[PDB]
Amino acid sequence: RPRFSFSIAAREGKARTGTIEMKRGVIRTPAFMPVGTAATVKALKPETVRATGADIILGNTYHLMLRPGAERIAKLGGLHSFMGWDRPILTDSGGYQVTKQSEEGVTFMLSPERSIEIQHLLGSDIVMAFDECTPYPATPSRAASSMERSMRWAKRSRDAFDSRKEQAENAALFGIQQGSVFENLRQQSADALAEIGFDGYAVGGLAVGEGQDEMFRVLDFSVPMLPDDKPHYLMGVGKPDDIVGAVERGIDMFDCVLPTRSGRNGQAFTWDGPINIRNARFSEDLKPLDSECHCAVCQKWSRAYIHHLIRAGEILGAMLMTEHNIAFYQQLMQKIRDSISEGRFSQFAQDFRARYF
Amino acid sequence: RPRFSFSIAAREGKARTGTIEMKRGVIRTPAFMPVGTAATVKALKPETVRATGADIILGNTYHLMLRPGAERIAKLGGLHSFMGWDRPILTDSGGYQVTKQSEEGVTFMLSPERSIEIQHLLGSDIVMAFDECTPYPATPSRAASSMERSMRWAKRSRDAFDSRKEQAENAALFGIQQGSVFENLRQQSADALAEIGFDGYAVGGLAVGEGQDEMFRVLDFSVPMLPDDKPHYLMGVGKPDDIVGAVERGIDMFDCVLPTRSGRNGQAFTWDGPINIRNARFSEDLKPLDSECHCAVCQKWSRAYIHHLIRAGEILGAMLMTEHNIAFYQQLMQKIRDSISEGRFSQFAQDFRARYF
Numbered sequence: 001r002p003r004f005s006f007s008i009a010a011r012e013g014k015a016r017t018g019t020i021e022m023k024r025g026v027i028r029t030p031a032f033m034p035v036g037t038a039a040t041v042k043a044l045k046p047e048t049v050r051a052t053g054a055d056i057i058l059g060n061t062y063h064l065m066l067r068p069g070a071e072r073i074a075k076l077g078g079l080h081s082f083m084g085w086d087r088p089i090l091t092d093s094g095g096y097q098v099t100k101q102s103e104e105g106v107t108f109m110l111s112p113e114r115s116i117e118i119q120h121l122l123g124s125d126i127v128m129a130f131d132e133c134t135p136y137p138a139t140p141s142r143a144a145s146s147m148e149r150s151m152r153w154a155k156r157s158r159d160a161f162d163s164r165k166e167q168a169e170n171a172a173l174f175g176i177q178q179g180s181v182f183e184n185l186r187q188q189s190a191d192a193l194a195e196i197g198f199d200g201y202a203v204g205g206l207a208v209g210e211g212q213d214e215m216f217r218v219l220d221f222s223v224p225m226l227p228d229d230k231p232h233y234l235m236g237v238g239k240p241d242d243i244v245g246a247v248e249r250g251i252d253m254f255d256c257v258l259p260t261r262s263g264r265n266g267q268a269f270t271w272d273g274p275i276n277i278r279n280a281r282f283s284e285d286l287k288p289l290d291s292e293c294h295c296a297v298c299q300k301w302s303r304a305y306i307h308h309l310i311r312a313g314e315i316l317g318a319m320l321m322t323e324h325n326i327a328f329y330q331q332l333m334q335k336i337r338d339s340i341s342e343g344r345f346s347q348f349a350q351d352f353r354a355r356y357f
Numbered sequence: 358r359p360r361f362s363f364s365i366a367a368r369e370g371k372a373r374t375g376t377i378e379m380k381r382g383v384i385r386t387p388a389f390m391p392v393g394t395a396a397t398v399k400a401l402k403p404e405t406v407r408a409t410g411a412d413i414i415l416g417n418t419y420h421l422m423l424r425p426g427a428e429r430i431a432k433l434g435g436l437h438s439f440m441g442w443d444r445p446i447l448t449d450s451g452g453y454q455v456t457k458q459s460e461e462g463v464t465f466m467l468s469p470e471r472s473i474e475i476q477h478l479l480g481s482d483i484v485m486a487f488d489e490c491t492p493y494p495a496t497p498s499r500a501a502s503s504m505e506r507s508m509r510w511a512k513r514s515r516d517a518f519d520s521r522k523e524q525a526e527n528a529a530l531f532g533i534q535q536g537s538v539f540e541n542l543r544q545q546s547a548d549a550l551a552e553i554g555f556d557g558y559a560v561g562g563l564a565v566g567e568g569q570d571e572m573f574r575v576l577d578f579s580v581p582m583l584p585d586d587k588p589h590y591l592m593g594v595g596k597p598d599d600i601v602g603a604v605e606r607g608i609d610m611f612d613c614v615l616p617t618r619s620g621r622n623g624q625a626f627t628w629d630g631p632i633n634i635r636n637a638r639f640s641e642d643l644k645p646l647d648s649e650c651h652c653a654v655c656q657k658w659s660r661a662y663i664h665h666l667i668r669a670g671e672i673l674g675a676m677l678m679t680e681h682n683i684a685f686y687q688q689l690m691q692k693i694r695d696s697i698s699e700g701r702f703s704q705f706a707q708d709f710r711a712r713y714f
């Protein structure tokens with residue numbers, strides 16, 4: 001395979017479906033990336049994560065540089081062999097999860113240069129530029145300052161990546177658009193990033209507390225500003241319905257800790273909306289978590305049993321809920337892909353919503 | 358298969374190897390039974406428990422009658438379908454895990470009759486008589502009182518089981534020898550139990566704080582008192598070396614929460630003795646937990662990674678350590694079985710010990 005090739009196989013409206021080919025495998029888009037916060041997708045073996053249909057996972061720089069240590073993982077062979085996942089890994093830059101801020105970077109040390117170096121040491125396949133994610137709400141002046149800084153850091157990221165030849169030849173680099181909710185700042189940011197040139201473009205600074213209406217409004221004008229022929233990654237999104245509407249607005253890649261996090265908390269996703277399995281109404285319910293789901297959890301165990309496990313604080317409860325939720329998300333992404341390929345995604349999006357709600 | 362058939366295929370000294378055939382499957386002896394305390398073997402799917410080589414698991418009456426409730430599990434189809442384990446399950450009687458004691462039973466209500474009924478409601482394949490496990494140390498008078506009570510309760514257990522025809526035709530009933538460390542009381546108990554007649558005989562009242570020397574001394578005279586042609590179950594034992602010496606003394610069946618419990622605590626069993634994976638010396642060790650182990654954990658992940666997970670409090674750490682430990686115990690039981698079958702168990706027991714220590 002190539003270092004990086006994104007191909008769009010089909011389109012409907014602003015929605016797109018295709019593939020990203022990379023040396024460690026192919027990524028079907030639109031894609032959902034399970035998140036691994038300390039070199040593990042919580043409560044799942046990597047073979048299980050793959051069995052749910054994931055093509056790529058998101059690795060944790062913030063956690064990893066602290067524990068176990070970037071240099072340490074490199075000494076041990078890199079993150080892929082360390083955790084036992086041999087397919088692509090996207091790493092965030094640490095431009096969110098972290099203090100003392102300056103133009104050089106953040107100490108708590110992290111700079112564009114060190115962030116790119118850490119992602120190299122981890123053996124990341126998709127490296128994210130080091131940015132500043134602008135708090136919400138933000139005034140226009142502060143959003144501009146933060147965006148401008150991020151754009152200077154994006155150039156420094158680009159140049160750090162390009163000077164390290166093994167990284168430049170084997171990994172991909174994504175830039176991150178900032179500008180909070182302001183169209184003119186989003187446009188300046190997009191233009192700056194396109195001028196520098198990246199392999200893919202994230203929409204940053206969303207999923208920071210704004211509502212779905214506001215996030216969608218900002219996507220409406222923001223995503224068309226990005227190069228059409230490169231992937232569009234919406235960081236930190238989201239709920240199933242957030243995902244469907246973001247695809248309707250041109251997003252190709254997603255990550256969210258919801259399916260894992262909330263799974264362990266008792267929330268299960270179903271085509272009829274989320275349920276909380278701790279609720280007493282499930283104590284004697286012999287049905288699977290979701291009536292259509294093809295996952296191994298729904299083939300084998302009842303709501304009543306998973307209810308019992310989560311109430312009892314049993315580790316298997318976390319395991320099963322997380323496997324189901326991540327399988328659910330992958331089935332959603334597959335339905336999205338197939339429906340765009342068949343020119344019926346807007347109908348799918350409506351059917352989905354009428355039932356989920 | 359039959360309701361119950363124990364066949365001894367080979368012997369060496371007091372050690373024996375063979376099979377227990379039951380309707381839900383065959384149990385290879387000497388056997389190690391993983392313990393499930395709330396209708397789950399902690400951190401393992403039942404398919405994983407089976408893959409490690411377990412033929413039977415031990416189900417938790419004390420926990421189960423409290424949560425989720427015996428009647429509830431029965432309403433839901435029984436423990437086997439509830440937890441997704443279709444092979445034999447041995448249930449303890451609640452004669453250990455629980456108050457106010459009287460000749461009728463214990464309230465906290467549990468009586469011989471109710472214990473046998475709960476095990477029926479759970480769908481247990483091997484039902485244990487309801488007993489009183491005598492604290493250690495115990496004076497001769499108190500050990501005698503407790504043993505005598507247990508023997509009266511053993512008759513009540515026998516008769517409760519026999520009057521319930523579905524249970525009597527499909528499950529097996531084991532009696533439990535008491536008498537603390539006193540030979541004459543162990544003999545009275547054995548005789549009482551043989552007179553009543555059971556499908557198998559546990560050695561109770563050990564693993565209650567006495568040392569290995571004392572436990573072995575009591576086994577030396579206690580196990581030959583039991584019927585030779587029925588299985589001998591040593592409740593709550595134990596460490597690998599406890600298991601080898603107990604087999605040398607005629608025990609056929611074992612349960613212990615050590616491999617699970619201590620696994621989650623960072624202790625891993627190896628042929629060179631136990632290690633604690635939290636120790637800093639493992640942070641960069643690329644070797645598997647044990648150099649010979651055939652388990653999937655040792656095929657795929659390093660000490661350094663499992664060290665990282667357990668230090669980080671990651672659920673996958675508990676999963677992997679528990680899978681390894683239970684696989685380790687099953688490999689031990691297989692080496693024991695094969696060595697008795699080949700007439701070289703006493704040599705195996707020596708080689709084992711010289712290396713483990």
Ligand SMILES: Cc1ccc(CCc2c3nc[nH]c3cc3c(=O)[nH]c(N)nc23)cc1
Pocket residue numbers: 035036037058059060092093094095096097128131132133134176203204205206207208235236237
């Ligand atoms: C494990 C892990 C990976 C990534 C993250 C933060 C990921 C994340 C966002 N999540 C929600 N909204 C987000 C916005 C940004 C952003 O603007 N820049 C960056 N670099 N990351 C973001 C947190 C944890």
Ligand SMILES: Cc1ccc(CCc2c3nc[nH]c3cc3c(=O)[nH]c(N)nc23)cc1
Pocket residue numbers: 392393394415416417449450451452453454485488489490491533560561562563564565592593594
């Ligand atoms: C899940 C679970 C199953 C079984 C048990 C207690 C199991 C157990 C013993 N464990 C160590 N020593 C033991 C002695 C006895 C005994 O004398 N009688 C009974 N009924 N159980 C014992 C505890 C937890």
Ligand SMILES: [Zn+2]
Pocket residue numbers: 289290293294295296297298299324327328
């Ligand atoms: Zn499912």
Ligand SMILES: [Zn+2]
Pocket residue numbers: 646647650651652653654655656681684685
């Ligand atoms: Zn192993």
